[PDB]
Amino acid sequence: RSYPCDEKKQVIAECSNRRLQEVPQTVGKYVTELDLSDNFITHITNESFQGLQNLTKINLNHNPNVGLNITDGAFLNLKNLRELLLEDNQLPQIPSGLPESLTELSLIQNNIYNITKEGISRLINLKNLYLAWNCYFNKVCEKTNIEDGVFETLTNLELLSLSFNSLSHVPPKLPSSLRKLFLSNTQIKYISEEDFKGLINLTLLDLSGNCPRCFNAPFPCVPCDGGASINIDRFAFQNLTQLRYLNLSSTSLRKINAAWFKNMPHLKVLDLEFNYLVGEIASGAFLTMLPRLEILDLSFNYIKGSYPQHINISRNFSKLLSLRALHLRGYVFQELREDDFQPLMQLPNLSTINLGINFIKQIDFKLFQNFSNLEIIYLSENRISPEFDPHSNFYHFTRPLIKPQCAAYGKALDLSLNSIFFIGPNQFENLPDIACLNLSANSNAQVLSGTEFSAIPHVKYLDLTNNRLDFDNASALTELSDLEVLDLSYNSHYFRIAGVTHHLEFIQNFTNLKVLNLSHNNIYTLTDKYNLESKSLVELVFSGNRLDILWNDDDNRYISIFKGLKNLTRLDLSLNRLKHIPNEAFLNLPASLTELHINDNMLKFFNWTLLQQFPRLELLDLRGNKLLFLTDSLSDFTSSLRTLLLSHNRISHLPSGFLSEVSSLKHLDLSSNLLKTINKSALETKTTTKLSMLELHGNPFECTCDIGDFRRWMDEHLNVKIPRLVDVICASPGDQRGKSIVSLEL
Amino acid sequence: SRSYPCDEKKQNVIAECSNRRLQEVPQTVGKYVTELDLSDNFITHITNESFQGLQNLTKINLNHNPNVGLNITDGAFLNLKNLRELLLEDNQLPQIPSGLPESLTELSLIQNNIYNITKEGISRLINLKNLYLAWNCYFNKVCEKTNIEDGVFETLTNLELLSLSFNSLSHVPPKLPSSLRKLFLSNTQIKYISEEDFKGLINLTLLDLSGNCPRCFNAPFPCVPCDGGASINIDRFAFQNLTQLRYLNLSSTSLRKINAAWFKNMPHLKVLDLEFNYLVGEIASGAFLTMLPRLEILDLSFNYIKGSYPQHINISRNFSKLLSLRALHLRGYVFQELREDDFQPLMQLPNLSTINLGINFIKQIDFKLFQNFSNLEIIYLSENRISPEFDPHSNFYHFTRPLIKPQCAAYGKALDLSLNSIFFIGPNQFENLPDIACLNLSANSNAQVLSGTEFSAIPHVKYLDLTNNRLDFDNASALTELSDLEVLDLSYNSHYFRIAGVTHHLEFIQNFTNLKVLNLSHNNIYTLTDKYNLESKSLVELVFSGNRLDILWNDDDNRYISIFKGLKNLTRLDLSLNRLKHIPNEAFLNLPASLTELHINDNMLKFFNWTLLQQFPRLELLDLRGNKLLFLTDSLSDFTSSLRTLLLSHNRISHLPSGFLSEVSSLKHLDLSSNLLKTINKSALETKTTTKLSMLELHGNPFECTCDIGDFRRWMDEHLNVKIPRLVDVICASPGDQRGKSIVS
Numbered sequence A: 001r002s003y004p005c006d007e008k009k010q011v012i013a014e015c016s017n018r019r020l021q022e023v024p025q026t027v028g029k030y031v032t033e034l035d036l037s038d039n040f041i042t043h044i045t046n047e048s049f050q051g052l053q054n055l056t057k058i059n060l061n062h063n064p065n066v067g068l069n070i071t072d073g074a075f076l077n078l079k080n081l082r083e084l085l086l087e088d089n090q091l092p093q094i095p096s097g098l099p100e101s102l103t104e105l106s107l108i109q110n111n112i113y114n115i116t117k118e119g120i121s122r123l124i125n126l127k128n129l130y131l132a133w134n135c136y137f138n139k140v141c142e143k144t145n146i147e148d149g150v151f152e153t154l155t156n157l158e159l160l161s162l163s164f165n166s167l168s169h170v171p172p173k174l175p176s177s178l179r180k181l182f183l184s185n186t187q188i189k190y191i192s193e194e195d196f197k198g199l200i201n202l203t204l205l206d207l208s209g210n211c212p213r214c215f216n217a218p219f220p221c222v223p224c225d226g227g228a229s230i231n232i233d234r235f236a237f238q239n240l241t242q243l244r245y246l247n248l249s250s251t252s253l254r255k256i257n258a259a260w261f262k263n264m265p266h267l268k269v270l271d272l273e274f275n276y277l278v279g280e281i282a283s284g285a286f287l288t289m290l291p292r293l294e295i296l297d298l299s300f301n302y303i304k305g306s307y308p309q310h311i312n313i314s315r316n317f318s319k320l321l322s323l324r325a326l327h328l329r330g331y332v333f334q335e336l337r338e339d340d341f342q343p344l345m346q347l348p349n350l351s352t353i354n355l356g357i358n359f360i361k362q363i364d365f366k367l368f369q370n371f372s373n374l375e376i377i378y379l380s381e382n383r384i385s386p387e388f389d390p391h392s393n394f395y396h397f398t399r400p401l402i403k404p405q406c407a408a409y410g411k412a413l414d415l416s417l418n419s420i421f422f423i424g425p426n427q428f429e430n431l432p433d434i435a436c437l438n439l440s441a442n443s444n445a446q447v448l449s450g451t452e453f454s455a456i457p458h459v460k461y462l463d464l465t466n467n468r469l470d471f472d473n474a475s476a477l478t479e480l481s482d483l484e485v486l487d488l489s490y491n492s493h494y495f496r497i498a499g500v501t502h503h504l505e506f507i508q509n510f511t512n513l514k515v516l517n518l519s520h521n522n523i524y525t526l527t528d529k530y531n532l533e534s535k536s537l538v539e540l541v542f543s544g545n546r547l548d549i550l551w552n553d554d555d556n557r558y559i560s561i562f563k564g565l566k567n568l569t570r571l572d573l574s575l576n577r578l579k580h581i582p583n584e585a586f587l588n589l590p591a592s593l594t595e596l597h598i599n600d601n602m603l604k605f606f607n608w609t610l611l612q613q614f615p616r617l618e619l620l621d622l623r624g625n626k627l628l629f630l631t632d633s634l635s636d637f638t639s640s641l642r643t644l645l646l647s648h649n650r651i652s653h654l655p656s657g658f659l660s661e662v663s664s665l666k667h668l669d670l671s672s673n674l675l676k677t678i679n680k681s682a683l684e685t686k687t688t689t690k691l692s693m694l695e696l697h698g699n700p701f702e703c704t705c706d707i708g709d710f711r712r713w714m715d716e717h718l719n720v721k722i723p724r725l726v727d728v729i730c731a732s733p734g735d736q737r738g739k740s741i742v743s744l745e746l
Numbered sequence B: 001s002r003s004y005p006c007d008e009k010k011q012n013v014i015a016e017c018s019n020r021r022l023q024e025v026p027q028t029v030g031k032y033v034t035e036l037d038l039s040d041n042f043i044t045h046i047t048n049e050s051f052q053g054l055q056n057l058t059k060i061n062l063n064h065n066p067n068v069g070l071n072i073t074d075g076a077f078l079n080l081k082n083l084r085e086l087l088l089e090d091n092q093l094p095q096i097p098s099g100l101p102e103s104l105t106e107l108s109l110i111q112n113n114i115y116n117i118t119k120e121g122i123s124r125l126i127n128l129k130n131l132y133l134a135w136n137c138y139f140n141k142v143c144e145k146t147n148i149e150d151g152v153f154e155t156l157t158n159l160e161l162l163s164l165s166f167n168s169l170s171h172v173p174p175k176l177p178s179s180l181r182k183l184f185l186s187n188t189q190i191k192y193i194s195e196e197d198f199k200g201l202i203n204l205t206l207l208d209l210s211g212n213c214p215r216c217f218n219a220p221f222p223c224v225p226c227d228g229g230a231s232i233n234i235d236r237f238a239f240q241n242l243t244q245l246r247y248l249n250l251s252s253t254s255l256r257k258i259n260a261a262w263f264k265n266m267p268h269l270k271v272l273d274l275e276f277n278y279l280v281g282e283i284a285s286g287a288f289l290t291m292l293p294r295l296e297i298l299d300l301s302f303n304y305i306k307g308s309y310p311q312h313i314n315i316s317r318n319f320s321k322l323l324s325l326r327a328l329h330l331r332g333y334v335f336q337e338l339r340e341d342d343f344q345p346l347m348q349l350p351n352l353s354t355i356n357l358g359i360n361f362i363k364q365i366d367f368k369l370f371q372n373f374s375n376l377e378i379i380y381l382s383e384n385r386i387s388p389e390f391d392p393h394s395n396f397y398h399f400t401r402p403l404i405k406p407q408c409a410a411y412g413k414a415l416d417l418s419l420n421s422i423f424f425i426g427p428n429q430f431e432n433l434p435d436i437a438c439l440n441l442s443a444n445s446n447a448q449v450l451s452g453t454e455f456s457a458i459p460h461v462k463y464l465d466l467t468n469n470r471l472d473f474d475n476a477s478a479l480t481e482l483s484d485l486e487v488l489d490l491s492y493n494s495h496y497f498r499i500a501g502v503t504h505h506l507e508f509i510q511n512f513t514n515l516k517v518l519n520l521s522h523n524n525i526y527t528l529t530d531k532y533n534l535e536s537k538s539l540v541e542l543v544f545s546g547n548r549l550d551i552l553w554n555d556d557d558n559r560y561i562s563i564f565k566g567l568k569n570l571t572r573l574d575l576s577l578n579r580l581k582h583i584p585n586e587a588f589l590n591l592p593a594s595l596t597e598l599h600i601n602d603n604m605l606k607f608f609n610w611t612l613l614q615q616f617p618r619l620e621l622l623d624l625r626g627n628k629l630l631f632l633t634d635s636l637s638d639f640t641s642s643l644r645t646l647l648l649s650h651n652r653i654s655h656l657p658s659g660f661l662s663e664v665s666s667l668k669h670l671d672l673s674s675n676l677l678k679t680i681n682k683s684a685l686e687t688k689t690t691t692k693l694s695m696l697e698l699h700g701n702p703f704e705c706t707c708d709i710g711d712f713r714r715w716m717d718e719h720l721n722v723k724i725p726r727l728v729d730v731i732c733a734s735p736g737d738q739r740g741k742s743i744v745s
């Protein structure tokens, strides 16, 4: 049982976020990677790691966790160290006498303003060198000094990142080994033809945020004199024949010199966000130079204060023969016509068009059918009617446009966050065969009645979340006979009113429906039909409703509410304010359940016996309740249960014979409870057990001699992992107070 | 000592002993006690020895015992000669128990399992004024009919209030005392009211017959109609001698016809609740309207015809005979358009102040119609379609809470248009309205750019509610037409705020010369355009809860460092729920010097620079609850002379500095509950002077109960002027024995 770290093969010592004061001295021989991020370590000496020659990767990010002291040659011993992460350590300098074995070194987010030869030029094996985010924004720092020729000695260097430092010119004498070069936000105003002249291997170049476009910047932003464009010499890119990625976002570009791409036949991704390129999108000589380009990002090039009637796309867009994705967020215009996108219509591979955040008031949807294979039509965040992760893209989020669960079904159309407050009879005509539709957050209050989706009747995943839907007709959505996933979360507006009717009967009319989400609808009363019924349904999410009201002891109408979900395997009843479940109501839950969540309720009572009616239940989640008794006879009540989740309850005593003969149970979580001790027969199985994971952190353990039968049990069963031992802590007595229980003389 | 377990206070001696997990009555009750509240504990037995040394009790409350039956002997109570009032609600009692004292003037047996009202239990108690017997047999509880022993209430000739509602009776019991003022028989399974059921009750001011022959369609509880969904049947002459009736409740009694005859001899009738009947026909032609010239409140709500969405509502011209009507509630009638002509009858009523039309799915309104009334104060149009468990002491048919927030309605004429679809306010939206002072436009899906002209037709609005919209704050003259605005709620308009790349402008704030309260809560504010500071000469309160001051004040951004400094008159600032892990010194120092109240609760603060309080001489209250602070300063009075309340509950303090209390000086209230304290060392309570503390909170700390805590107990024994709530929850964590034993024992 490793302590304090958590070990595994995958051979990694996970030692992060554990209030460590110093490199622990207790780590296994077979360990090759040590992760000590997020601790309180302030010193590193050549002792620190002395009995650890086999380490190939150390991670010391974020130490002390709110300046790390490192002795010259501290790691110099570690003769197999390939990767050293020293991010966010308040380091005032590159550490002296780093080992030559390093292929990877990260000094992101430090106070290093001097990039010296003593520092680095030594380390001739480097492939990846990260020096970003040392001087930036309103931080108190100095201009970055790069010793001349410091990088030329690193002749296998492939990735150099110096972003978010004050450099003012590209540094000279860079090794021709380079594949990727990040120079974003370095306050460079001029690129000469010398700067990159030798880098014949470069696949990526990032010059974003030099001469930034500052208007409405969400960060401290300093533009070049007068808002000036960055100045890029005609021949600056002439020997960059392998470039596939070019980031020129926020460089205040008004004009794109086509000749920049004369010698760049492989360009795949061009990022041109936050520029002033309305004019060049209408004209655009440079589009003829990019016949292999697959992704083009021209987001946020809107003219301050303008709201043009229409968008203006050059005919030269038809020359982007390989184009797969076109991002045109934040251009800002009122109407999209069939004609305005003619140049895009013959591109064979264009599968994504993104027009989010343009305040578009109207669109001629028939246009979209005139395309070869659009798969994703993203119109989120428009007007349509009836603090910076260093390792992430700085100019936008990188999560996919459409949830992949929805996109997997086919053609997707995302109309979320609009003003489509009522769906009328022709709203969806002239559309392609949409498989995935997002109407989330449209302030939609209509009564759906079985015809609104008849022009796209093959929708398979329908997102209707965050509306105000009025469920006053039993034929709602029944035109969608292939429906597989229906999300109705956050439609509480009408559900919360007792006096209006509420019809959930249409659920039974689907033959392929597998997942239904009814969460946060405040459901506590229904009209006429009190049961949910489906033959197909496999997961129901019912969190954030009022079962406590539906199952009131004095009302029997909802006693069978879920029973007719004949195929259900997964049911989520969290956040339903449940004090107790009536025995009849619990026994009327579908017997096909394999997963049941009743967490974050106020349960003061669970009848363990009724599990006997649930021969397939593998997971029971009772976290975040107020339970205070565990049955002593669980072996009698289930033989399928694998995982019991009982953290954040008020369990004070673990009964003797609890494990009894529960052979199937593997994961038992009893963290954050009121356990003062565990006794021998609470632990005894005479059977063959599968238990491998047992969570006990956050209990107020009594660290008298009564704790020894459990300490002994830990040694007796090293096959059972107890995570976060350093959080398995002595409450009493006061000297023991704050001790981990394993750290005690018994 | 200090009283224990109960809290003792004086009012009009009350001993609050509620909700403490008491396994039994204490024998540590102050012999001076007159009112004993023991509700919501785990008491399972009551005996003749339970209240042994306790003559002086006039009132006992034992409701909700045991929390999850209560067992009470014959005459456990009669030894209490001064007991007038005895509350035994929700105790799962099989029986009106025996030998209750003759002194009783009030007895409550609401919410038990009693189906036998016998002479044996009830008829000896001739001093009763109020007898509450409701909610023993109802809905789908396992349940026998209520047997009311013949003439069992006739000897209680002091009885003014009898409530038997929510029991199965089938008829009004006969032989009821003529002293009755108030009679509650709602939901008792009565289908017929006879000539004879009320004729000796010439003193009745209130009769409740609601839920007899209920209208059951879409009911939120198990509801059983009368055969054929038939109406309650009430003899023509049933109310003949009810001359004193002020209040009649006939809700949910399936009425289609109101016999104007029922009111012939009811000249004082003031409130008539007819909710949930079938009265659309009567409302259209009601002869009974001519019988009610002193009616003040008429509730006709939820009388809709199922499946009908009529174009207009049909108000009988007879409504104009209700010359005393103050309020008219017509929710849930259901109709599409309100026209000027529809309400003609109402318009010459002198005192009609409240018109309520919530939940009618109305689509179009002729707003100028409202000008034509005498003095409308409240125009409640919430929950429509306008475009550009059951507490036994509550009213069962609706909530009683006000229709308009009092703070808003205090300014004058109120118009509530919350929960509509007024997604855009256009040039004439508000023409021909009266002079509106309080305007509620919450939850209208409104996403427009407010530009300073949208309220021009009601320029004297002083309380504006705009919460839960999607407002696009892109123009610095927004709202500036409202020169008299004092209160502005912009909570939950995060839609556009959360998007970094659109413009956000709050400069309009400085323009208001009368603005006192601004609520910007839960807007997810983390970036604004061009102007980064909030400025106002007048503003007194700003709620900035649930935004991202963690981003606005991130260490490498100086832009928002004086965000709140231009609020020169501010005294209350709320900065809770902003995810703050630390406030930078300078940003703290730039908070208004006028502050008297600062809330920085429910953030993640690890450190607090106490020294900085030196800049806030008026600061009286500091709320740091729900953070992660480990450190208290040892030199507080070096930094404050003003602080009276310091709230520190739910932090990580496990040590109090030497001298800390009586450092306090002006400090009246210290809350240190839910921390990590093991003791309070003599040092901590040492105190150079004598503490000014009157309240100290310490419960839910993990105290170590060894002779190490004697110091503190003797501190506690000395200073009886320092109250400690919840001593039951001031608990031993260690050793064991004894955890869970209060440090008081």
Ligand SMILES: *[C@@H]1O[C@H](CO)[C@@H](O[C@@H]2O[C@H](CO)[C@@H](O[C@@H]3O[C@H](CO)[C@@H](O)[C@H](O[C@H]4O[C@H](CO)[C@@H](O)[C@H](O)[C@@H]4O)[C@@H]3O)[C@H](O)[C@H]2NC(C)=O)[C@H](O)[C@H]1NC(C)=O
Pocket: B165, B182, B186, B206, B208, B210, B247, B248, B249, B271, B273, B391, B392, B393, B394, B395, B396, B397, B398
């Ligand atoms: C039919 O119509 C009549 C109205 O004409 C209605 O009668 C009202 O019933 C309620 C009880 O539901 C009475 O309200 C209570 O009155 C007492 C004493 O004045 C108060 O103590 C009660 O307050 C308690 O609870 C309150 C909230 O739960 C708390 O504020 C407080 O702490 C108290 O513990 C409560 O206000 C009301 O007095 C009568 N009206 C008259 C004029 O007597 C009746 O309820 C209707 N029937 C149905 C079934 O809805």
Ligand SMILES: *[C@@H]1O[C@H](CO)[C@@H](O[C@@H]2O[C@H](CO)[C@@H](O[C@@H]3O[C@H](CO)[C@@H](O)[C@H](O)[C@@H]3O)[C@H](O)[C@H]2NC(C)=O)[C@H](O)[C@H]1NC(C)=O
Pocket: A163, A180, A184, A204, A206, A208, A245, A246, A247, A269, A271, A390, A391, A392, A393, A394, A395, A396
């Ligand atoms: C300008 O555009 C370039 C090219 O698109 C961006 O390069 C991309 O940068 C991100 C984050 O800096 C890289 O992601 C990270 O890299 C590795 C993947 O090997 C992964 O371990 C991390 O989780 C993280 O995903 C991404 O690799 C990189 N793209 C390529 C092809 O190298 C760049 O970020 C943009 N510049 C700015 C300031 O936004």
Ligand SMILES: *[C@@H]1O[C@H](CO)[C@@H](O[C@@H]2O[C@H](CO)[C@@H](O[C@@H]3O[C@H](CO)[C@@H](O)[C@H](O)[C@@H]3O)[C@H](O)[C@H]2NC(C)=O)[C@H](O)[C@H]1NC(C)=O
Pocket: A405, A406, A465, A485, A487, A489, A515, A516, A517, A519, A539, A541
């Ligand atoms: C309504 O309920 C549905 C169904 O539970 C929610 O969608 C589901 O969301 C979970 C994420 O919480 C998805 O699980 C994830 O799958 C990915 C990739 O396969 C995996 O990496 C994650 O570890 C996790 O397993 C699940 O796929 C998804 N199901 C579907 C069908 O989309 C939905 O999010 C809920 N809606 C709201 C508004 O909360």
Ligand SMILES: *[C@@H]1O[C@H](CO)[C@@H](O[C@@H]2O[C@H](CO)[C@@H](O[C@@H]3O[C@H](CO)[C@@H](O)[C@H](O)[C@@H]3O)[C@H](O)[C@H]2NC(C)=O)[C@H](O)[C@H]1NC(C)=O
Pocket: B407, B408, B467, B487, B489, B491, B517, B518, B519, B521, B541, B543
């Ligand atoms: C937005 O902020 C305002 C100002 O704080 C909120 O209105 C205020 O709400 C508080 C309650 O949090 C009111 O105080 C209470 O008032 C009653 C009446 O005296 C009293 O019984 C209580 O002791 C308490 O003091 C305060 O009066 C009120 N102020 C105004 C001007 O209305 C408002 O609720 C917030 N809005 C939202 C949606 O959260």
Ligand SMILES: CCCCn1cc2c(n1)c(N)nc1ccccc12
Pocket: A447, A470, A471, A472, A494, A499, A500, A501, A502, B302, B304, B309, B332, B333, B334, B359, B361
């Ligand atoms: C007060 C509401 C009574 C029953 N009712 C009427 C409804 C409705 N439920 C409901 N849920 N929606 C409606 C939409 C348009 C017109 C009428 C209705």
Ligand SMILES: CCCCn1cc2c(n1)c(N)nc1ccccc12
Pocket: A302, A307, A330, A331, A332, A357, A358, A359, B449, B472, B473, B474, B496, B501, B502, B503, B504
């Ligand atoms: C991507 C938008 C750039 C700046 N901008 C344009 C806006 C706006 N912010 C904003 N907040 N609202 C708008 C409403 C209508 C038309 C344009 C805008």
Ligand SMILES: *[C@@H]1O[C@H](CO)[C@@H](O)[C@H](O)[C@H]1NC(C)=O
Pocket: A321, A322, A323, A348, A349
């Ligand atoms: C389109 O993409 C396909 C990959 O599915 C590829 O094989 C083909 O080269 C591309 N065609 C053009 C014209 O770029």
Ligand SMILES: *[C@@H]1O[C@H](CO)[C@@H](O)[C@H](O)[C@H]1NC(C)=O
Pocket: A380, A401, A402, A403, A406, A416, A417, A438, A440, A441, A463
């Ligand atoms: C729909 O849009 C909302 C908001 O833009 C987003 O949160 C959600 O994931 C989207 N749904 C799908 C299925 O992509």
Ligand SMILES: *[C@@H]1O[C@H](CO)[C@@H](O)[C@H](O)[C@H]1NC(C)=O
Pocket: A511, A535, A536, A537, A538, A567
């Ligand atoms: C039940 O669910 C399974 C998925 O496990 C599906 O294949 C089967 O068709 C469903 N049964 C019915 C009757 O729909």
Ligand SMILES: *[C@@H]1O[C@H](CO)[C@@H](O)[C@H](O)[C@H]1NC(C)=O
Pocket: B382, B403, B404, B405, B408, B416, B418, B419, B440, B441, B442, B465
């Ligand atoms: C406005 O309407 C909402 C929704 O009905 C309500 O919660 C809020 O308190 C009302 N505001 C005022 C000021 O009365």
Ligand SMILES: *[C@@H]1O[C@H](CO)[C@@H](O)[C@H](O)[C@H]1NC(C)=O
Pocket: B513, B516, B537, B538, B539, B540, B569
């Ligand atoms: C400051 O606030 C007080 C209290 O509302 C008010 O009386 C006074 O007029 C305000 N001062 C200014 C300059 O607006």
